[PDB]
């Protein structure tokens, strides 16, 4: 439970940008294995992660440090590459979003404090 | 070049830590599809990336910004997740290295 300048950056600059991205829509809520006909999803992916959960954790001061938050973003993208076929459009969508994620993280303010 | 603090950090902290890690050995040279018996590898992975390449690039000041180096690290990990079966040990090794990558990048100095 903390508010830091980096977590505020992650909430208000990084997530705001990814959230509104045209490829973001499959990532804004937990993967719905029932809706999508993916009965194997939870057998392969043991730690589901999505932006909605990350955003809410940012708003409830769940994270102690930015790195904890960056790890959740990473799990979300990693689940997608691991579960899906290489040829699935979702993979290209994740890669596009994760490039922004890394770009924005490179500009994160570096007095880790509050 | 004079080397940005960011690229100095990627070399002296991030690559330092990854190169020597006990899980790093599959990642230190390009994947050898012939040696490993992987006739589909270059069908699926269109942009191979490995630490030897990234390390050489850091040594020779090939990179213009930190984010370009960080992209290469990301491509290397991602190739791995995309190509291999979810249950392969290599995936776990990649996940462990990448967690370190992200942990360190969290503390990387500001640009400019």
């Amino acid at each position: 439970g903390r508010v830091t300048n980096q977590l505020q950056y992650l909430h208000k600059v990084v997530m705001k940008a990814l959230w509104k991205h045209q490829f973001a829509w499959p990532f804004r809520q937990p993967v719905d294995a029932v809706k999508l006909g993916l009965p194997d999803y939870h057998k392969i992916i043991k730690q589901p992660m999505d932006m909605g959960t990350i955003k809410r954790r940012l708003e409830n001061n769940y994270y102690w440090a930015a790195s904890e938050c960056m790890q959740d973003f990473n799990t979300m993208f990693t689940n997608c590459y691991i579960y899906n076929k290489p040829t699935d459009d979702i993979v290209l969508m994740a890669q596009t979003l994760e490039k922004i994620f890394l770009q924005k993280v490179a500009s994160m303010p570096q007095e880790e404090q509050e | 070049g004079r080397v940005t603090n960011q690229l100095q950090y990627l070399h002296k902290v991030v690559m330092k830590a990854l190169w020597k890690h006990q899980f790093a050995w599959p990642f230190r040279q390009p994947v050898d599809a012939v040696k490993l018996g992987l006739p589909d590898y270059h069908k699926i992975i269109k942009q191979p990336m490995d630490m030897g390449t990234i390390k050489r690039r850091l040594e020779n000041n090939y990179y213009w910004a930190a984010s370009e180096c960080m992209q290469d690290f990301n491509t290397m990990f991602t190739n791995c997740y995309i190509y291999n079966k979810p249950t392969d040990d290599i995936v776990l090794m990649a996940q462990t290295l990448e967690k370190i990558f992200l942990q360190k990048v969290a503390s990387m100095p500001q640009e400019e």
Binding site: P86, T87 | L36, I45, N84
Partner: peptide
Amino acid sequence: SGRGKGGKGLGKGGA
């Protein structure tokens, strides 16, 4: 990439 063959490669070996 990763692009070409949808499925999941063939792999390096599991555990």
